[PDB]
């Protein structure tokens, strides 16, 4: 059963609704981005039209093996007609190929679905500035004031400086970065750049990165592990056991590992500043957890919503508990009363 918050009223459209079988009345299935909770249910045997970005479409074709005839890529920032309804895709500032969708209903209603997003003031000068939005389907992942984290720029600065210092002190140190999905590519690309190395990785991850339209990508990544001093591994292997085991496989080339685990928010953020972050260490292995977020902080979310002034908000995350729903509704009312809409 498809839940109400994945349906677009007055249309034959659903958003990120691939795990409910054939949805009654659905003429087009939109996919905001290539993350498993959102594409859950898509496969090579899917036979309905899928609307998405060019990058998302590359991944559907190459990773999930969806047939080309059912993939409908749309350009960003461009008015398009889909089954008689005007739509626009906007960059979501999430992972590569992630979009927000503007729907212009035949009756005059305007709906924005953010997908997953990290709100930014640059969105206030997109095609959103042009008109009123009546309903907002909002990524509420971190909709509570305790959720603070630094900018992506500050986090990258910390990681670059940390890696460069360690490897300059010890040329036989290896840097390892964890991953379990697309997104957060800047972490490992920025580190490899400062160290004058390509990033080494599995054939499967290399394949995924080749779908993302990153400029000069052939210059930045490789499957030849031996030529590389920045390696990518599955997030599950970023622990003392997993990393000891990996060091053994490198054949006495290295005698130290420095590893990074990009997480979302962690309770550590309430106490410590990014400058003061320290690793967990065991012998010749150190592990840094760094708060690189691709979702809005509470303050970023509040600013976007108070700017947009929607008439109704429909949360799409943390909808499963009454306590969550009650908390989110209280903040929406606070924001409205403070700003005056």
**Which residues, numbered 308-327, are part of the site for ligand B0Y (CB under 6 A)?**
311-312
Residue 325 touches which member of ligand B0Y, Ni ion, none, C-beta under 5-8 Å by kind: none
**Which residues, numbered 282-311, are part of the site for ligand B0Y (CB under 6 A)?**
311
CB of 27 to ligand B0Y, least distance (A): 21
Cross-strand pairs, 312: 135
x/- site string to ligand B0Y, residues 187 to 226, per CB under 6 A? Answer: ----------------------------------------
Residue 107 engages ligand B0Y in binding (rule: CB under 6 A): yes
Among 6, 35, 118, 198, binds Ni ion (CB under 5 A): 35
CB of 46 to ligand B0Y, least distance (A): 31
Give whichever of 48 and 341 is closer to ligand B0Y, judged by the CB atom.
341
How is residue 259 written in tokens?
Answer: 């590893």
**DSSP secondary structure code for residue 78 in this structure:** -
How is residue 195 written in tokens?
Answer: 């160290």
Binding segment for ligand B0Y among 71-79, 102-110, 156-164, 316-324 (CB under 6 A)?
102-110
Residue 186 touches which member of Ni ion, ligand B0Y, none, C-beta under 5-8 Å by kind: none
How is residue 329 written in tokens?
Answer: 């509704």
The region, left, alpha or beta by phi > 0 then psi within -120 to 50, assigned to residue 308 is alpha
Residue 108 engages ligand B0Y in binding (rule: CB under 6 A): yes
CB of 105 to ligand B0Y, least distance (A): 8
Helix (H, G, I), strand (E, B) or coil at 146: coil
In the block, residue with structure tokens 């670059």: 160
Among 134, 157, 207, 309, binds ligand B0Y (CB under 6 A): 134
Give whichever of 20 and 335 is closer to ligand B0Y, judged by the CB atom.
335
Residue 116 engages Ni ion in binding (rule: CB under 5 A): yes
How is residue 86 written in tokens?
Answer: 């005007």
Backbone angles phi, psi at 131, to 5 degrees: -160, 170
Calpha distance 212→195 (Å, rounded): 23
Give whichever of 37 and 338 is closer to Ni ion, judged by the CB atom.
37
Among 27, 109, 202, 210, binds ligand B0Y (CB under 6 A): 109
Alpha helices in the chain (DSSP H): 36-39, 54-62, 152-169, 185-194, 203-210, 240-249, 298-308, 322-339
How far, rounded to the nearest angstrom, does the alpha carbon of residue 244 sit from its chain's CA centroid?
A: 29
Calpha distance 102→128 (Å, rounded): 9
Residue 118 touches which member of ligand B0Y, Ni ion, none, C-beta under 5-8 Å by kind: none
Helix (H, G, I), strand (E, B) or coil at 179: strand
C-beta of residue 152 within 8 angstroms of C-beta of residue 340: no
Calpha distance 71→97 (Å, rounded): 14
Residue 35 touches which member of Ni ion, ligand B0Y, none, C-beta under 5-8 Å by kind: Ni ion
Binding site for ligand B0Y (CB under 6 A): 107-109, 134-135, 311-312
Binding site for Ni ion (CB under 5 A): 35, 116
């Amino acid at each position: 059963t498809c839940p109400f918050y994945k349906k677009i009223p007055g249309t034959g459209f659903t958003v990120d609704a691939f795990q409910y079988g054939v949805v009654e009345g659905c003429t087009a299935y939109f996919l905001t981005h290539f993350h498993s909770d959102h594409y859950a249910g898509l496969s090579k045997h899917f036979t309905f039209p899928v609307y998405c970005s060019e990058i998302t479409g590359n991944l559907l074709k190459n990773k999930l093996h969806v047939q080309e005839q059912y993939i409908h890529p749309l350009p960003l920032d461009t008015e398009c007609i889909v089954n008689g309804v005007k739509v626009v895709l906007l960059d979501a500032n999430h992972c590569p190929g992630a979009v927000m969708i503007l729907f212009y209903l035949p009756n005059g209603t305007v709906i924005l679905h953010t997908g997953d997003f990290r709100a930014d003031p640059s969105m206030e000068r997109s095609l959103l500035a042009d008109q009123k939005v009546h309903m907002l389907y909002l990524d509420t992942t971190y909709c509570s004031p305790e959720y603070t984290f630094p900018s992506q720029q500050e986090v990258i600065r910390f990681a670059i400086n940390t890696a460069f210092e360690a490897v300059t002190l010890n040329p036989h140190a290896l840097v390892v970065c964890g991953t379990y999905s697309i997104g957060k590519e800047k972490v490992f690309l920025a580190i490899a750049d400062v160290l004058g190395s390509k990033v080494g990785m599995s054939q499967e991850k290399y394949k995924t990165l080749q779908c993302l339209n990153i400029p000069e990508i052939n210059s930045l990544i490789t499957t030849d592990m031996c030529s590389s001093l920045v390696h990518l591994l599955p997030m599950m292997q970023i622990n003392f056991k997993g990393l000891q085991s990996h060091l053994k496989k490198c054949g006495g080339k290295y005698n130290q590992i420095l590893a990074f685990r990009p997480t979302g928010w962690t309770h550590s953020n309430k106490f410590t500043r990014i400058a003061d972050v320290i690793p967990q260490t065991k012998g010749n292995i150190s592990i840094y957890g760094i708060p690189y977020s691709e979702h809005s902080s509470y303050l970023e979310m509040k600013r976007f919503v108070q700017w947009l002034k929607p008439q109704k908000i429909i949360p799409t995350v943390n909808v499963g508990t009454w306590k969550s729903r009650s908390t989110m509704e209280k903040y929406f009312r606070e924001w409205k009363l403070e700003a005056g809409y």
